Design a protein around this ligand. Structure first.
Ligand SMILES: Nc1ncnc2c1ncn2[C@@H]1O[C@H](COP(=O)(O)OP(=O)(O)OP(=O)(O)O)[C@@H](O)[C@H]1O
Ligand SMILES: [Mg+2]
Lengths: 50, 496, 50, 50, 50, 50, 449
């Protein structure tokens, strides 16, 4: 929804969903690129936290 | 020759006038006429490395270091067991060596080493027809201290696949495979760490333990007994008592070495053969004292943190009084760079410093010092370069003075009126006035610092404008300050 | 008190420092009445002599 | 006798000092960088944290 | 009773116990404890009753 | 091997077990490992055994 | 001086220049080198080592690329200290054996001098003349070197950015070797490719800049990785601590007692004379010199010559040693304020220690971790995450995309930049090549003549 000032509301669920999608897509790229185990393990931990 | 050699209990022989990179050729001369080892005691580890690159140039005898723990006293790092493999091996060959130079610094000479009972109690020679069982040899290596792996690559590991037992001994630099049959060794074949296939087969091979302390269960029980005798236990799983009782080893456990043995560690002067001849460099009474002071300071600084407490430094290192009371059991040749006055046990060796030789493109003739020095020298002269290409970098620099140096391998080859060149890591030259020879290294064509950039003449462009700093300026009179620009002077002020 | 508690700012390289001399509150751009009318803060611009 | 009054001036001064800590961090950074002879006490100090 | 609960006996062990209380890990030395304690409560820069 | 069903290993202990028993054992980490532990479990036989 | 202004609008267009350079290199056919078996086996026997089986694969690929009619274009992206240079040196021997005037291009004067020394060491038994041109050479011998090269008598010319300044004319150039390419920029990398169209570019680096890494993985340039560790290389231990005088003193004393040498990187010339004077009071046992590229040439050259001959231990330096100075005895680098350094720069600085059988540490001192920025934290937690041999390619493929591959047809090697796709680029290149094959459009660079 907009705030009538040209700016949109935060809508905290979209922020969490966007962070989850960001970490998941980054992790897919790391899996495709055959990333080293420690980097992909850190990213998997961050996806779990998201 | 110019000086006899000391062969008695502790008689000394001081050699004087030895300039830079002359200690190397004197060590190489001594090492080829003493029927026995030479244990060169460098005053500093850096210098040791320097000497290892210099003496090996002048001679063909085996000149090797003794690999120290690369850590610092009471540090928190392991010595990287490969170095341990280069340290144990020497300690096995040290009681029986007949020719060569072994270079120890004071840091490593003041240390205390295993009991050599642990050397020839945990070290073996394996021949072909050994009637030793598979599991018997496996538990032999497990008691020695090796690590059971499946992919042995480095020092101190072994792998077992039924009748195929492949181990990497710490004697050689290559691993071996045994191919057991009827509880007997059938082959002793060297296999590569990259191709994993046999290269050839050795009739008799030597293996050495994994660490400088025993590791098996009886040794761990002895360690715990000695620990509860000396220090005190805390129940916390990174204390180095309950971290060793579990089985693993801490980072810097090598400093809790006298806890494994129940016999004091020998001063390493026990390892020397029956007839060595210690050769000195610089002074020991200042480097040993500095090392003892630094080790004691670090012990006081770090002998806190009751989890991982430290042994006394007299349990691990020789006291300086001990070291100088143990150097009195061996003959010594002390090489020092000064004029030793006159007495028996004292000789002078004419080793004048090199004259002023330098190159600079400032003049028309850059090689003027060289082209005049080489003309008025009656003996030989030997250039000493460090690389091969550097040879050409000096081979076409002496072409401007019409001199081509014939290459020699040993400095004894120099004839009377010769200009030679030889390759090695000698740093500074000398003039041996005894036999009228000269050695000119690469760093003797450069000289001192040509540092003349103190200032530039900024006194130019000073006219009436400057006014000779009369300081009679009135307020509001415009002023130029060439760093920043044009402003208006506004009087004299005081500031903090 | 704030300026004396913070300044002089000495560099860690070790060559220069920035010390404080005095401060002065300038005249406000507006005053109270048109600050309320336009909808802007009634504030004075701080001017410090570094 | 255990509770204390923080009136308008004290709280505003504390907030000013909190904002001035970031400024002195930035100034110390710019001073510790090299080549100070072309600088003035305006290139390093920014009025936005205050 | 506190002295009989005290697991230390001298000054350096007490300082090292404080050091290990503050920052777990970071194996103690002798200056790392003494300087920490002297800058904890007894430094004009990092401690100030008003 | 020596290792039992769900004994946890520290990173260093995992390196030790990977060097020493580097055969086909399945020692993983994260939600993949937890999902494998849950999926390789039979509840009925476990219920009767308990 | 009106610095505020954003000047004009792309004073030049680089899409057309780079497209024409690519479409002229891909139109004609390069030199087909002739390989000698038993005359190159002697040069192999001059190598006092054994080529690791992954470097004796990069060498084989390089030679089997040079011996074909197509123009070589390769990357040799292997991690630091793994023997990348000897691949270039074997390529240079095959080139010079056919009288083809190798040109080696390195992005600093210390690399210029060290590669001059290494090449002169290696080619010390062949009729091959090797010469260096940079600012360390004078102004009277630089013109002598240029006259010799244009005459055709210097067969290997090692140089810095001087090799691109339009007065360095090669007689018959047959091989280019760009070493440490991630410090040059696109204009510097085709400034010589434009003049000699069909030259064989061999490109050595450890951490490529993202453009020339995506360009290598996407099939535009051949790739040859060298992760195979050498004789006894050990993983360099990375410690990320807040700055502490006790930590600095302990590291320097640990290295001095071992006999090695210390790099102490400050990266600020204005205060380096105070940092060294302060460190010489913190650690009195050390002998300390200062080395950077903004002091006079006959002083920096002599300081860096003294450092090789063990005349001092610690050398307080700028990032002029980021480029690949070997110095095998130096085994401890201490980066004073490592928050503002790239991942590529940090890994290159970490690569200067090791190089031998010793164990080498690397301390990256930081400020208090609430005072660092966020990107510094992400960079440091990545440089400390990867401490393994061969981690210079995973780090490069992390830097690429973290920063994204830049414009494939333009400049700006690192960045998102909304580049055109590879499919559009290959179609454009084929269109330009096909339009140039028919009506042979002269080379644009010759039009500049
Ligand atoms: N196969 C090998 N076995 C043992 N040592 C090698 C081998 N190949 C190279 N080396 C040594 O490793 C060192 C690596 O230095 P070099 O400059 O050649 O490669 P590099 O450092 O990766 O290149 P750069 O300086 O461009 O980063 C060389 O001094 C060389 O002596
Ligand atoms: Mg290189």
């Amino acid at each position: 929804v907009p705030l009538d000032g040209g700016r949109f509301a935060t809508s905290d669920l979209n922020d969490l969903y966007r962070r989850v999608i960001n970490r998941n897509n980054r992790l897919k790229r790391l899996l495709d690129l055959a990333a080293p185990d420690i980097i992909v393990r850190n990213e998997k931990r961050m996806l779990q936290e998201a | 020759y110019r000086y006899t050699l000391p062969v008695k209990a502790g008689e000394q022989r001081l050699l004087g006038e030895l300039t830079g990179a002359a200690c190397a050729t004197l060590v190489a001369e001594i090492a080829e006429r003493h029927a026995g080892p030479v244990v060169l005691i460098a005053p500093d580890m850096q210098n040791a490395l320097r000497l290892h690159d210099e003496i090996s140039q002048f001679t063909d005898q085996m000149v090797m270091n003794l690999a120290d723990w690369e850590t610092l006293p009471y540090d928190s790092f392991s010595p990287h067991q490969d170095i341990i493999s280069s340290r144990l091996s020497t300690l096995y060959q040290l009681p029986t060596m007949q020719r060569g130079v072994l270079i120890v610094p004071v840091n490593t000479l003041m240390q205390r080493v295993c009991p050599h009972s642990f050397l020839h109690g945990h070290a073996l020679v394996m021949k072909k027809g050994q009637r030793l069982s598979r599991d018997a040899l496996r538990t032999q290596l497990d008691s020695a201290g090796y690590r059971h792996v499946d992919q042995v690559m480095e020092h101190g590991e072994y792998a077992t696949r039924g009748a195929l037992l492949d181990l990497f001994p710490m004697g050689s630099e290559l691993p071996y495979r045994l191919d057991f049959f009827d509880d007997e060794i059938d082959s002793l074949r060297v296999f590569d760490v990259d191709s994993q296939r046999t290269l050839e087969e050795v009739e008799a091979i030597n293996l050495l333990p994994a660490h400088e302390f025993p590791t098996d269960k009886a040794a761990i029980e002895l360690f715990r007994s000695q620990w509860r005798d000396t220090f005190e236990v805390k129940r916390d799983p990174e204390h180095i008592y309950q971290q060793v009782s579990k089985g693993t080893l801490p980072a810097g456990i090598e400093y809790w070495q006298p806890l494994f043995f129940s016999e004091p560690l020998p001063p390493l002067f026990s390892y020397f053969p029956a007839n060595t001849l210690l050769v000195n460099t610089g002074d020991l009474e200042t480097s040993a004292e500095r090392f003892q002071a630094d080790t004691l300071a670090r012990f006081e600084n770090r002998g806190v943190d009751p989890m991982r407490p430290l042994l006394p430094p007299q349990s691990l290192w020789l006291r300086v009084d001990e070291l100088f009371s143990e150097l009195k059991n061996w003959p010594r040749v002390q090489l020092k760079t000064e004029h030793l006055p006159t007495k028996a046990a004292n000789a002078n060796l004419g080793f004048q410093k090199l004259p002023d030789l330098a190159v600079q493109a400032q003049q028309k003739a850059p090689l003027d010092a060289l082209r005049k020095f080489l003309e008025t020298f009656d003996g030989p002269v030997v250039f000493s370069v460090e690389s091969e290409g550097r040879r050409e970098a000096l081979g076409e620099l002496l072409a401007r003075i019409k001199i081509a140096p014939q290459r020699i391998m040993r400095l004894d080859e120099a004839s009377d009126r010769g200009r030679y060149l030889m390759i090695g890591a000698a740093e500074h030259g000398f003039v041996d006035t005894v036999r009228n020879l000269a050695l000119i290294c690469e760093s003797d064509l450069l000289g001192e610092r040509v540092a003349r950039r103190r200032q530039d003449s900024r006194r130019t462009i000073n006219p009436d404008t400057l006014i000779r700093n009369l300081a009679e300026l009135h307020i509001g009179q415009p002023v130029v300050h060439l760093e920043h620009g044009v402003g208006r002077y506004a009087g004299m002020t005081t500031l903090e | 008190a704030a300026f004396r508690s913070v300044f002089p700012i000495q560099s860690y390289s070790g060559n220069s420092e920035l010390q404080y001399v005095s401060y002065r509150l300038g005249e406000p751009v507006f005053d109270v009445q048109e600050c309320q009318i336009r909808g802007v803060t009634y504030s004075a611009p701080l001017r410090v002599k570094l | 006798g255990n509770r204390r009054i923080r009136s308008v001036g004290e709280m505003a001064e504390n907030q000013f000092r909190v904002g001035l800590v970031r400024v002195e961090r930035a100034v110390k950074e710019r001073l510790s960088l090299g080549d100070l002879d072309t600088l003035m006490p305006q290139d390093m100090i920014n009025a936005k944290p205050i | 009773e506190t002295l009989r609960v005290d697991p230390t006996n001298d000054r350096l062990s007490a300082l090292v116990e404080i050091y290990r209380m503050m920052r777990p890990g970071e194996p103690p030395t002798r200056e790392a404890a003494e300087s920490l304690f002297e800058n904890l409560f007894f430094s004009e820069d990092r401690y100030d009753l008003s | 091997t020596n290792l039992e069903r769900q004994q946890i290993l520290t990173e260093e202990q995992y390196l030790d077990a990977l060097e020493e028993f580097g055969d086909e054992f399945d020692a993983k980490m994260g939600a993949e490992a937890i999902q494998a532990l849950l999926k390789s479990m039979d509840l009925e036989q476990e219920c009767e055994q308990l | 001086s009106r610095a505020r202004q954003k000047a004009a609008e792309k004073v030049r267009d680089v899409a057309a220049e780079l497209l024409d350079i690519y479409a002229q290199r891909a139109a004609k056919e390069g030199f087909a080198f002739k390989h000698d078996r038993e005359q190159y086996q002697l040069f192999c026997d001059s190598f006092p080592f054994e080529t690791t089986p992954d470097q004796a694969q990069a060498i084989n690929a390089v030679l089997s690329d040079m011996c074909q009619p197509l123009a070589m274009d390769r990357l040799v992206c292997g991690d630091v200290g793994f023997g990348k240079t000897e691949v270039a040196m074997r390529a240079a021997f095959l080139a010079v054996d056919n009288h083809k005037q190798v040109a080696v291009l390195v992005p600093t004067t210390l690399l210029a001098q060290q590669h001059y020394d290494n090449f002169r060491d290696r080619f010390a038994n062949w009729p091959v003349r090797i010469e260096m041109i940079s600012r360390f050479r004078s102004a009277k011998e630089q013109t002598q070197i240029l006259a010799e090269v244009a005459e055709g008598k210097i067969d290997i010319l090692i140089g810095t950015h001087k090799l691109l300044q339009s007065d360095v004319k090669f007689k018959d150039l047959g091989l280019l070797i760009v070493d440490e390419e991630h410090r040059f920029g696109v204009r510097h990398k085709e400034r010589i490719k434009a003049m000699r169209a069909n030259v064989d570019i061999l490109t050595l680096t450890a951490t490529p800049i993202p453009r020339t890494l995506n360009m290598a993985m996407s099939g535009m340039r051949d790739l040859s990785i060298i992760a195979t560790p050498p004789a006894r290389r050990l993983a360099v231990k990375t410690f990320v601590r807040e700055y502490d005088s006790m930590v600095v003193r302990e590291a320097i004393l640990r290295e001095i007692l071992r006999g090695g040498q210390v790099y102490y990187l400050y990266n600020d010339v204005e205060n380096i004379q105070k940092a060294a004077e302060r460190l010489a009071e913190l650690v009195p046992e050390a002998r300390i010199a200062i080395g950077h590229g903004q002091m006079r040439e006959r002083e920096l050259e002599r300081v860096m010559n003294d450092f090789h001959h063990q005349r001092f231990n610690v050398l307080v330096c700028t990032t002029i040693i980021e480029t690949g100075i070997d110095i095998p005895t130096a085994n401890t680098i201490i980066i004073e304020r490592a928050d503002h350094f790239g991942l590529a720069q940090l890994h290159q600085l970490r690569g200067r220690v090791g190089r031998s059988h010793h164990q080498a540490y690397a301390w990256l001192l930081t400020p208090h971790p609430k005072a660092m920025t966020t990107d510094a934290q992400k960079r440091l937690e990545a440089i400390a995450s990867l401490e393994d041999l061969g981690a210079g390619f995973a780090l490069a493929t992390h830097d690429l995309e973290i920063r994204g591959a830049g414009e494939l047809l333009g400049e700006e090697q690192s960045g998102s930049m909304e580049t055109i796709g590879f499919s559009l680029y290959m179609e454009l290149l084929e269109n330009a090549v096909d339009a140039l094959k028919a009506g042979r459009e002269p080379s644009l660079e010759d039009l500049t003549s």
